Each structure stands twice: as C-alpha cells, then as structure tokens.
Amino acid sequence: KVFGRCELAAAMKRHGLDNYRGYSLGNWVCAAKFESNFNTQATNRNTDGSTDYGILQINSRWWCNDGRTPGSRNLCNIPCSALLSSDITASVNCAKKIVSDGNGMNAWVAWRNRCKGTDVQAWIRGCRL
Numbered sequence: 001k002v003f004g005r006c007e008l009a010a011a012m013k014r015h016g017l018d019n020y021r022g023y024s025l026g027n028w029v030c031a032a033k034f035e036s037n038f039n040t041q042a043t044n045r046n047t048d049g050s051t052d053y054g055i056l057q058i059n060s061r062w063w064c065n066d067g068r069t070p071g072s073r074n075l076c077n078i079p080c081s082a083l084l085s086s087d088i089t090a091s092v093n094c095a096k097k098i099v100s101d102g103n104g105m106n107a108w109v110a111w112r113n114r115c116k117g118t119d120v121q122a123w124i125r126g127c128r129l
Ligand SMILES: [Cl-]
Pocket: 005, 033
C-alpha cells in the first residue's frame, strides 16, 4: 500500500506515535517519506547481507527474522514479512522499541540526514487529525 501523506499521519497518530519519546508526528511522517516513499512494500538490501523492510525500513540485522541474515537478532520478535503489510501496526510497534533503545530517531539514517533540524511540522500541515 502506498499511503497518502495525511492518511499516514492519521494512522500513525491512532497508533500512538505523536510525541512518542518526544518525537512529534511530523518527524515520523518525514522519516517514512524518505525511507520508503510511503510504500509499505519497500525493501532494500544492505552491504552486510541484511535487508530493510517496510514503511520505516526496519533492518533484519537486529529487529526481525527473514531467515537469510546469519548471526542476526530478532528483537521485535516478528518475521520481517509482517512489516510489509498494508496494516502498519507491526511496523509501529517495532519502531517504538527501536526509538526507545537510547539513540532516538538517529537509528533512521534518512531521518538524521533529511528531517532532523528541519521544520517537520510541514509534513502534517493541512491534515485533518
Ligand atoms: Cl509527499
């Protein structure tokens, strides 16, 4: 599923991401835009053989099991394919664990390079929330 901007904002708000660990909703929408272009089915392989999955590009090196990342962890206790669903629940719940692990949203390279320090409120401007 390719979300619209305000559609995704509303779904992320319903799932408790607005101001989660102090990160306002626009931060999460901005991260999703540049990680996946709002596409739940996005995948990208990494140099070390791990793969990033879904709207927030969560990495099989640490967070999910895809059966093809030897020596990795599965800290969200899910198959990586669950992060590709049109229902964003699994991605949101895993993202909550990630952002709580000490490094905040710096875990998302695209957030650090394209959202951090910008006017992220623009990503939810005009949306009925
Ligand atoms: Cl957009």
